[PDB]
Design a protein around this ligand. Structure first.
Ligand SMILES: [Pb+2]
Length: 125
């Protein structure tokens, strides 16, 4: 229904940073004339809605490849109370951007001793 996102997670102890890798999306819904969308991904760690990143916009595709990694300065021991949000939006030059769908990861469930890379279905906000 809302597409899928492939991402990965890691933690860098040398800089005390969470690494969020945004790989690609697939089967995104079309939101623009011509049957396509202009997707990008907004990435942030709740409850800090202020520190925020966006991938580049990939215009007129429903299957964008991003290959962008973002870093969040957060102490390892405090990660547990955070929730990572990866939200795919349709870019618009002129107006407020419409959300397509999102995936959330409660950080207390992440095992940094094993692989984290995966495809996940986007959900409505
Ligand atoms: Pb658009």
């Amino acid at each position: 229904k809302l597409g899928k996102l492939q991402y990965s997670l890691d933690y860098d102890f040398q800089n005390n940073q969470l690494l969020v890798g945004i790989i690609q999306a697939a089967e995104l819904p079309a939101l623009d004339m011509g049957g396509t969308s202009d997707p990008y991904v907004k990435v942030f760690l709740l409850p800090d809605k202020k520190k925020k990143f966006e991938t580049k916009v990939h215009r007129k595709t429903l299957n964008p490849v991003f290959n962008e990694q973002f870093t969040f300065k957060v102490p390892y021991s405090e990660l547990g109370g955070k929730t990572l949000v990866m939200a795919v939006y349709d870019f618009d030059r002129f107006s407020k951007h419409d959300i397509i769908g999102e995936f959330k990861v409660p950080m207390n469930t992440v095992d940094f001793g094993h692989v984290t890379e995966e495809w996940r279905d986007l959900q409505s906000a």
